[PDB]
Amino acid sequence: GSHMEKSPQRIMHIDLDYVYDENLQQMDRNIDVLIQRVKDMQISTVYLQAFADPDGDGLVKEVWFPNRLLPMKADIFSRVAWQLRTRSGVNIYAWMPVLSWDLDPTLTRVKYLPTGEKKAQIHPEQYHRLSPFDDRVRAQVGMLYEDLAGHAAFDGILFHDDALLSDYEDASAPAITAYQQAGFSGSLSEIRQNPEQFKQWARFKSRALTDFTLELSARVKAIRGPHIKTARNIFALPVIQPESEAWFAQNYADFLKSYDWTAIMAMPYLEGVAEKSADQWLIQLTNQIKNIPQAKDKSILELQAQNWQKNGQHQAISSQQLAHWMSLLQLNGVKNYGYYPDNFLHNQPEIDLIRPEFSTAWYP
Ligand SMILES: N[C@@H]1[C@@H](O)[C@H](O)[C@@H](CO)O[C@H]1O
Ligand SMILES: N[C@@H]1[C@@H](O)[C@H](O)[C@@H](CO)O[C@H]1O
Ligand SMILES: N[C@@H]1[C@@H](O)[C@H](O)[C@@H](CO)O[C@H]1O
Fold it and tell me: Which residue, 89, 205, 347, 351, shows the most beta carbons closer than 10 Å to its own?
């Protein structure tokens, strides 16, 4: 069976880390408040965190659903999902990491080759990703997605933005083997700097990530049904500067063909854009999108509602600023959009302030 999605898409991207409370009665009230908040927002879709992320340290150690391989911090994904689907009027996408799982140490990790060093290493300021070139990684991540699919009912999958590789990655042994078997000549350095192979190499890696996600969605669809929608977060640079695929292994046209929804992280401050230049940056982004026929109809522009800091103390973005950006998108012909993150505990962003620009059901 199939499942239609009413135009336009308006998305809340929601973490469960602060919904969780070790006091069961408090967690009950938290969930009730969250369900009511999404209901009142009157939008179309929630991208719902299925994994725990208490530290923001780029590695999933625990999840919100029972499963074979990782600790379950609390059984709350299915509980929140079915109530959002029936009380709050939204489709639910299970938001899952693709690679950043704290599994068996013998499983291959993604590594990069540091300039001037012989041995590959793990990049300190990147997601702690397992290698998609390790068959056992593919198997075990497959088991996690199947465990999710078997325990919970939902409408789609959002594949995490951790499915990325730089131009010095993946330097792990299984990755080297894969390149060699795919006909690439020499070391990673020689490939990376080979005029006749470096672009083909970037595309090989982009496709390997994409094919891996499609393996996962097939496994979920086998259990839940064919109606399950797919979405994947894409970084903005591969959209506005496609040569940057070389150090993201993400390709916008590929996403548009492969997934139901391409969730662009339309986040200027994340990309280092000055406050006074953010609107123009977003305008340029929408221009690039509109220049690709039908791209906007399969893309979601995900705005940021926090300004993340290296030292961990993230700075909020005002509801006014967020509503302003939503209006900017609308006025530039983009109707599918959303934001991350949400904070029910402080009504941030403020329901009453963003609904006019966010909810299609809103009236004066
Ligand atoms: N523009 C640079 C690339 O030139 C470089 O190769 C890459 C390395 O990861 O990072 C980018 O910021
Ligand atoms: N912090 C990420 C990096 O992955 C990347 O270096 C940067 C440049 O595009 O975009 C950000 O979202
Ligand atoms: N910089 C972090 C990353 O986890 C991610 O790339 C992005 C998601 O929206 O923003 C923050 O959460």
Answer: 205
| CA–CA separation, 182 and 193 (whole Å) | 17
Q: Which of 307, 297, 294 is nearest to 340 (CA)?
A: 307
Q: Which domain holds residue 32?
A: 1-364
**Residue 64 burial (10 A CB sphere; 0-12, 13-18, 19+):** buried
Tell me if 167 CB under 6 Å of ligand 1.
Answer: yes
Q: What is the CATH number for 285?
A: 3.20.20.80
Number of domains within the chain: 1
Q: Which residues are CB-contacts of 232 (< 8 A; sequence separation ≥ 6)?
A: 158, 159, 163, 213, 255, 258, 259, 261, 262, 263
Tokens of 221: 């669809």
Burial degree of 22 (CB within 10 A; 0-12, 13-18, 19+): exposed
Look up tokens 């990049």; give the residue. 123
Cα-to-centroid distance, 204 and ligand 2 (Å): 21
Ligand 3 pocket: which of 100, 265, 270, 340 to mutate (most atoms within 8 A of CB) = 270
100, 235, 281, 310: which to mutate for ligand 2, most atoms within 8 A of CB? 235
Mention every residue, 6+ apart, whose C-beta is less than 8 A from residue 71.
61, 62, 63
Dihedral sign for Cα 14, 20, 24, 25, please.
Answer: negative
Q: What's the 98 CA to ligand 1 centre distance in angstroms?
A: 23
Contact criterion met (CB below 8 Å) for 10 and 358: yes
Q: Report which protein residue has its CA nearest ligand 3's atom 6.
A: 161
- For 342, list phi and psi in degrees, rounded to 5: -110, 150
- The strand pair at 306-307 and 315-316 is best described as antiparallel
Nearest protein Cα to ligand 2, atom 10 = 271
Q: Count how many Cα atoms sit within 13 Å of the Cα of residue 310 in the half-sphere of its side chain.
A: 5
From the CA of 235, which ligand is nearest?
2
